Amino acid sequence: MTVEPFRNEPIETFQTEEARRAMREALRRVREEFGRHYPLYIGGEWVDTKERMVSLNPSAPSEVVGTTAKAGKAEAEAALEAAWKAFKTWKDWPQEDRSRLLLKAAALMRRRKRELEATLVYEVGKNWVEASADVAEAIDFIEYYARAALRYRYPAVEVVPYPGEDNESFYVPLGAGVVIAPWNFPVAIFTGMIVGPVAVGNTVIAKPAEDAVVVGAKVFEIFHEAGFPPGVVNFLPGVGEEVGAYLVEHPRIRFINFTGSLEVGLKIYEAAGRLAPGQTWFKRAYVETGGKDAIIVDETADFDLAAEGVVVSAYGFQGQKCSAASRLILTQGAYEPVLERVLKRAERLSVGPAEENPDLGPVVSAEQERKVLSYIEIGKNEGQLVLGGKRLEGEGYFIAPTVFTEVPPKARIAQEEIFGPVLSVIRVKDFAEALEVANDTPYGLTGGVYSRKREHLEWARREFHVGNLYFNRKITGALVGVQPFGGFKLSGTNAKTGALDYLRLFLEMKAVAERF
Amino acid sequence: MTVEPFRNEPIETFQTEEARRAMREALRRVREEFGRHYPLYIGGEWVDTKERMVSLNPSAPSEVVGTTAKAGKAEAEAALEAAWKAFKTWKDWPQEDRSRLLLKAAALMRRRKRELEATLVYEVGKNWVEASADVAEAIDFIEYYARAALRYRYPAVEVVPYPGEDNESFYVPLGAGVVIAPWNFPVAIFTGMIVGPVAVGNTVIAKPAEDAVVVGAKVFEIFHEAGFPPGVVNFLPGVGEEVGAYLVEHPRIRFINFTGSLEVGLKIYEAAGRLAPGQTWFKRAYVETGGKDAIIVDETADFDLAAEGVVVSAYGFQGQKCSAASRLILTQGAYEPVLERVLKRAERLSVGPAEENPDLGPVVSAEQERKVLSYIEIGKNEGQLVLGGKRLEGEGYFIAPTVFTEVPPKARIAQEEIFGPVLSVIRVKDFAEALEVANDTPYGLTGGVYSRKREHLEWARREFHVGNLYFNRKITGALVGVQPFGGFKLSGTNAKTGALDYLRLFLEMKAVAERF
Ligand SMILES: NC(=O)c1ccc[n+]([C@@H]2O[C@H](COP(=O)([O-])OP(=O)(O)OC[C@H]3O[C@@H](n4cnc5c(N)ncnc54)[C@H](O)[C@@H]3O)[C@@H](O)[C@H]2O)c1
Ligand SMILES: NC(=O)c1ccc[n+]([C@@H]2O[C@H](COP(=O)([O-])OP(=O)(O)OC[C@H]3O[C@@H](n4cnc5c(N)ncnc54)[C@H](O)[C@@H]3O)[C@@H](O)[C@H]2O)c1
Ligand code: NA
Ligand code: NA
Q1: Residue among B261, B417, B502 whose CB has most ligand 2 atoms within 8 A, to mutate
Q2: What phi and psi values does residue A249 have, to the nearest 5 degrees?
Q3: What domains does chain B contain, in order, with CATH numbers?
């Protein structure tokens, strides 16, 4: 197989009339279909259930955006049978054939990008560019993994020869596994976590987040049209602690690919370490969990550039990103100039229905709203509220961009993942102390430094202990291929997405010697 | 760093007078040294304790080969402090410097090879060639990992460029971890599991098996002479279920590198999945566990070649190998001719004190003897005893080469790892049934096929589900670099030793972007 060198899918900015027209058209088509019901997808067919899952518009939660079937234990068993049956033959496809299937799915996704973006807007409250970035990232994962999988093809392993023998080492896929996905990147991460394992010959049972079941179904429409053989990919919307846990704990689940909260990741990793009755392998579990990400700014920085990057990083998709800047660490010389600029910019941010392309849409659910508001209450006891900190008018879950200052580094709002538009500002003496404060959390996902001082940047390169570090730019929006994505410490297992290393996680090696 | 291409250390056969003379002198000096005491090694110094570990000669267990100090919780804590302190600076050594340190250790081990072989003869009852293979493999691990580590050096990751930015991804070591090692390859596997992680900048607390503490100490003499900085490698002989478990469960242990029984591996993998109080990472655990390994022979095979390779694979080091042929699966046409030849060869095998260079020395301990004899009793009620099945006369733990035939595939002796000189012969119709029987165990470590039929060999290449498969040769003695070693299923986590992929297990990746 020979295709063009990988390039990232351009993120639409909607600066042209044609792009805005195309978006409005997509928004209309999507809302005209709010009545739709999407079944499970098991063994190559759409299979309905008695019970259902309801998905709401977080900008107008009295409005249903769609319903799906609801997978329980019986449907999990059906999916397991289908996935193990498919594995027996899918594992034997030439890599070139599997890679071409991914490339087809990517081409189909690219053709439906406005529809998918519009679905993100209405289902999870992304503004237009956040939605476009999400879909473009999904396309990127498919294009990238299609190509990366060829680097592992039979027989890929470099071994030392021995006289009178052929020695041949090669990779084989593991089996059928479960993918458990979050609501915050429910096209990008959902797609990546499925197609990586699948590309190299695994089969997958995919469990979308409850808040993003409709857009997950639309991704499965693409997989179905692409023509993945029956059982290779399966769609099981349902309750995480029910069907999700059932699959995690199952003796016949070979691996678990999880992205989500630390709370859940901890349970999954623990369960994965147990031998279920009758289980005949050591389960692999990849858990990519939260962050408490900081941007450090020192007195040598471009303060206007820093302020812009901080606001983008803190408030993009309402701060509901594992990569979001939730801490702003300012050295004494940087404190007033940067804080004043951050406040001036943040106070100009618009909040409203996502479809109007505001700076911020709503948080995703009543539960998220409750969590973020509860953290705002905690923060009022720990630091000084200086901006926002309120729900805004309307049924939608609109929360104002929030800033706390004078926040102690060990404060709950400085340690715990709030996952909302809440920035904690911490004053430190110098760069050394900035790094100490940056590192002193249980997490290690993203981080940033604004500074012109070379020695500070290079010191951070060595010592700011996060998996994805950025200098003089935003700390969100890691691009597939460019910035292998994944953290340290309780940010998870360091499964680096959009990197060659990712696919190795879903392979095991056999060594076969013939003495002639 | 530029060195000669890797080559495996030749295994001494002792056919020349020069080799015999050298070995006789080494054995004499080791024997003259019986009763020596070896302290712990923590933070670059030898540290004694009040309690001790006693190491007996299994050929004459009234004889004490040596004693060591005994590590408990306080010593584990001291080692943790030393290893983490050392990690802070060891991780920053240029890879070339760390690799040169390994190469020095290899040169020192090579110069002491006869002494180390002699120590294995007395301490774990290896005959001369089994001892030589063990030490040669240890040297191979050091030489191989020293070179492989350079392939990961800063900045090693292939990434996609982005306009206006430098994007740099690179590997960093994890931290301080624990190595927990078996008695059966107490130089090779002990050395490999330590030096791999250490090569790429980790630090290690090494827990040798109780029955092999003296030879573990001699490996540490080499590490000390080589000049590893204080704290980089630490030696904690002690009780596995005490100090070993303490380290496995500790919130400050970053990774666990384990090779040993399935029973213990299961406990370790489960414990590793738990977040210990105050722990700030997801522990990595590699567990390389047992096997129930089969050789298939069909009617097309060279029966004489097959019988020789079966006898070598089944009885080498008294069957005390994770790779040992404990099952012989014969198609109908192969049954009589191969079994006849196997019995005739096996009944000629000598058994006696390992110093005499017999075909088989003793099993390693009274407990091992008890377990093997117990399995022989079980076997008598499951299959047909046709050779051996007895303890031989003498103080040493001598067990005769044993063969059961017409063994049901689901019999305990056909399923459970006995780890002694006990071969279970299984009669099947054809090659298809041979593969079914071969695959139907909880394990998946080594396997072999003797056949001249190309289609049967290539079928096994695809479907005989073991990590290390060999055609028309013995299934033991995987060579570093040549045959990446490690299994499937309950044979472990497929950490492939003596392969480039091994070192990746002890690294995490950071991605750093600078926008100019
Ligand atoms: N590290 C990363 O790459 C990354 C990326 C995106 C999001 N996240 C994290 O995701 C979190 C937000 O996503 P979320 O709210 O969907 O997380 P969540 O943990 O609540 O749920 C994630 C998924 O797990 C399922 N689930 C819930 N409980 C389960 C259980 N006990 N067993 C099995 N499955 C269960 C849910 O139904 C959902 O599909 C944040 O912490 C964020 O940091 C991390
Ligand atoms: N897969 C492989 O590469 C491979 C290689 C060699 C040996 N083995 C396996 O090793 C076994 C024989 O070795 P062994 O008898 O030394 O095995 P073992 O499991 O009894 O002990 C191995 C090590 O673990 C320690 N240990 C025991 N209990 C522990 C606990 N609860 N927590 C932490 N550590 C503990 C022991 O002290 C020893 O150091 C066989 O099953 C064999 O197949 C596997
Ligand atoms: Na929704
Ligand atoms: Na001993």
Answers
A1: B261
A2: -85, -10
A3: 1-289+480-516 (3.40.605.10), 290-479 (3.40.309.10)
